[PDB]
Amino acid sequence: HHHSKGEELFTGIVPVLIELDGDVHGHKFSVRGEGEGDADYGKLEIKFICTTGKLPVPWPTLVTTLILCFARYPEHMKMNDFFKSAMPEGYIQERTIFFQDDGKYKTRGEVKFEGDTLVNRIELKGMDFKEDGNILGHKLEYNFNSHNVYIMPDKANNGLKVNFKIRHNIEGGGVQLADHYQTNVPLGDGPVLIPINHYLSCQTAISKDRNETRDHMVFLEFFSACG
């Protein structure tokens, strides 16, 4: 490794802990995720549990909120890997996600090492949602399509501006758009890699655990940097 010290933290399998605090339309909920990341493979394997009971939104609408440091950057692209460069002190990731003809998520997380573990600690607020819309009415299929994530430098803030659209299939036919606006800024003082325009290619498989009695999501994701 020769472009950032933080890259060295991602050799082999890294434990992952995700803690999400949410509040949408008067419904408070918590999600806890535990799993492993293999950045050399761009692979995540996580199981998520709603620790507060029933999730009051569809699991697919939380995927993007619930760690881009696990992307596979090919050698010729590794100079562009902001996410690993910020480690171990990590980065703030902030989004507004606009659901077309419905409400928005406002999210803010810290992604950083806590000892051996890569942690995403994140808050979500859901504003202006329709009680009978596709989100609060649970009208979205239990799946997640392939998407590209568009990364741009933000030299002014020593970080990133990121944008992409998620297409959520509606039960019975139709697509619900979720427009993602994102920023990343470092938490620490160390040097970071400010990239050129590039994108991540993201494949996701969500499933259920036969044995699990809690509201939950089994999660498999592969993502790669392309330029």
Author numbering: -1 to 64, 68 to 228
Question: What do the study authors state?
Answer:
We characterized the fitness peaks of four orthologous fluorescent proteins with a broad range of sequence divergence. To complement the available data on the avGFP fitness peak (Sarkisyan et al., 2016; GFP from Aequorea victoria, Hydrozoa), we experimentally characterized three additional GFP sequences, each with a different degree of sequence divergence from avGFP: amacGFP (Aequorea macrodactyla, Hydrozoa), cgreGFP (Clytia gregaria, Hydrozoa), and ppluGPF2 (Pontellina plumata, Copepoda), with 18%, 59%, and 82% sequence divergence, respectively. Mutations in the chromophore eliminated fluorescence and mutations of buried amino acid residues had a stronger effect than mutations of residues on the protein surface. In all four fitness peaks, a threshold effect of accumulating multiple random mutations was found, such that the median level of fluorescence dropped sharply once a certain number of mutations was reached.
We solved the crystal structure of amacGFP and analysed it along with structures already available for other proteins. By contrast, the fitness peaks of amacGFP and ppluGFP2 were substantially flatter, with each tolerating twice as many mutations. By contrast, few genotypes with >5 mutations in flat fitness peaks required epistasis to explain their fluorescence level, with amacGFP requiring almost no epistasis at all. Indeed, the two closest sequences (82% identity), derived from the same genus, are the sharp, epistatic avGFP peak and the flat, non-epistatic amacGFP peak. Therefore, we performed an array of assays aimed at the biophysical characterisation of the four wildtype proteins and an additional genotype, amacGFP:V12L, which differed from amacGFP by the V12L mutation that was extremely common in the amacGFP mutant library. Specifically, we observed that the most mutationally fragile protein, cgreGFP is also the most kinetically unstable protein and the most mutationally robust protein, ppluGFP2, was also the most kinetically stable. These data tentatively suggest that the shape of the GFP fitness peaks, as characterized by mutational robustness, may in part be shaped by the underlying protein stability. Peak analysis is consistent with the following oligomeric states for each gene: amacGFP: primarily mono- and dimeric, with small fractions of tri- and/or tetramers; avGFP: primarily monomeric, with a small dimeric fraction; cgreGFP: primarily dimeric, with a small tetrameric fraction; ppluGFP2: primarily tetrameric, with a small fraction forming large aggregates or oligomers. The propensity for aggregation also appears variable between the genotypes, with amacGFP showing the highest aggregation of non-fluorescent genotypes. Interestingly, the V12L mutation in amacGFP:V12L appears to have shifted the distribution of the mutation effects, substantially increasing the effect of mutations on the barrel lid in proximity to residue 12, without impacting the overall mutational robustness.
